[PDB]
Amino acid sequence: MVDAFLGTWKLVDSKNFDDYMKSLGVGFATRQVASMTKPTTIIEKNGDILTLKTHSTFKNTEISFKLGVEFDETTADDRKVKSIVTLDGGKLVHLQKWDGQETTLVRELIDGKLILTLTHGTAVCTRTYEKEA
Numbered sequence: 001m002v003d004a005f006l007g008t009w010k011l012v013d014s015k016n017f018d019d020y021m022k023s024l025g026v027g028f029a030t031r032q033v034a035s036m037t038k039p040t041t042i043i044e045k046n047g048d049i050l051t052l053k054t055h056s057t058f059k060n061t062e063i064s065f066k067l068g069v070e071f072d073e074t075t076a077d078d079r080k081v082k083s084i085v086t087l088d089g090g091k092l093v094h095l096q097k098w099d100g101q102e103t104t105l106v107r108e109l110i111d112g113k114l115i116l117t118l119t120h121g122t123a124v125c126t127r128t129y130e131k132e133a
Ligand SMILES: CCCCCCCCCCC(=O)O
Pocket: 011, 021, 026, 030, 034, 039, 041, 054, 059, 075, 076, 077, 116, 127
């Protein structure tokens, strides 16, 4: 069900990421570096367990999870959140909850590109990833 998401992906477009980061309270110097960074995202499975790596010259993260099972996560901007990832309409939907706040990280495949939509508050960011061979 998740298999078309698997592989190595590189950032090739970003819209409103500064808005999203600012909404989360990320400081200006971090936003400045992140606005110029192009991460590589690696999505792998082993049975029921997905691992999602995000690599860059600035921040690195890695999470492992089972779809539909809550997990603790510490985000790239150091939020300690309760997370769940599911498939919904063919999209990989990652919901993070902390302190009564929520953010969603929604991934969908359009014409072979991975579109990541990040929503927090009113901020909506769209980042496009292309597959590496
Ligand atoms: C410290 C920089 C901001 C991190 C905000 C939360 C994670 C964003 C992930 C974006 C992406 O995977 O393209």
